[PDB]
Amino acid sequence: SNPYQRGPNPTRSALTADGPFSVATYTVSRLSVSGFGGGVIYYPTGTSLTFGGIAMSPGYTADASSLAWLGRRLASHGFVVLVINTNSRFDGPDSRASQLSAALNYLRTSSPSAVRARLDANRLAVAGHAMGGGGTLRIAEQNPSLKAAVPLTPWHTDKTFNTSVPVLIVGAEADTVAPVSQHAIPFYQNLPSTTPKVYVELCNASHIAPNSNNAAISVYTISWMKLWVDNDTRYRQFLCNVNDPALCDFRTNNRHCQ
Numbered sequence: 001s002n003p004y005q006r007g008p009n010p011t012r013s014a015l016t017a018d019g020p021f022s023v024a025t026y027t028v029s030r031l032s033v034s035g036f037g038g039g040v041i042y043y044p045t046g047t048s049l050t051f052g053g054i055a056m057s058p059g060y061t062a063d064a065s066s067l068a069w070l071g072r073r074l075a076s077h078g079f080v081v082l083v084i085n086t087n088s089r090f091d092g093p094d095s096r097a098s099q100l101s102a103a104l105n106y107l108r109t110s111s112p113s114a115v116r117a118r119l120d121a122n123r124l125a126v127a128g129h130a131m132g133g134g135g136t137l138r139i140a141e142q143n144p145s146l147k148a149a150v151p152l153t154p155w156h157t158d159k160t161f162n163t164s165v166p167v168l169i170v171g172a173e174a175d176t177v178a179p180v181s182q183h184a185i186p187f188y189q190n191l192p193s194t195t196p197k198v199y200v201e202l203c204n205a206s207h208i209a210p211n212s213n214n215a216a217i218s219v220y221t222i223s224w225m226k227l228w229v230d231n232d233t234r235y236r237q238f239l240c241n242v243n244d245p246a247l248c249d250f251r252t253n254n255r256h257c258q
């Protein structure tokens, strides 16, 4: 009945590992594009289906490889994921927003045929690590068509974003680079009260927790993307009535659960 629904009924165990789909990659060379530094597209193969798309940005001084595990994890659960490299490794968060915007336009207008055949360009979301997550919040403000945004241990000097795009922010308790008291939590609190939003804080986690395989990040990022990109309400169970011992803070206005 939901034409965008993919994969068997989820289990928490299943969302901590690569999913039902084989994954291929397409390397986007830096010279092949303008507006961002190229990157890697992870996309499902062995299938004739189409899937929503996600543009993902790494953080300060980092490249696409720092989120390669997450790009492949999301792809394997049924998404087309472009993890970008930036024009300069020292680009700030608003620059990363512009480069996410170029990456989304590339997906919708300049995709390789192998990517486009697996892509429903009408259903796009964004995600990002650190300054990349700052850029995710800025692009959510500009582009109301986005289905979801997931900033991972985000960093931004701007603390105030206006968007109706549903936002789930992942904070890291022990983050000294983007302390949650100065970034993640102000971001959550200053988002509109009418916008479906969730803040989770991983116990004992560091700023680099998003840069390698992480069960909690996998569960919440897949579930948020499934819920909003696919309208797949089967993933409400992991985001609602939440009792998760991996988490040491949880905040929501609960607008995503019905």
Ligand SMILES: O=C(O)c1ccc(C(=O)OCCCCO)cc1
Pocket: 058, 059, 060, 061, 129, 130, 131, 132, 155, 177, 178
């Ligand atoms: O995106 C990241 O992971 C990230 C974000 C911020 C810093 C940082 O040191 O902020 C202080 C200095 C600002 C520019 O020098 C480092 C890394």
Ligand SMILES: [Ca+2]
Pocket: 158, 159, 160, 161
């Ligand atoms: Ca602002």
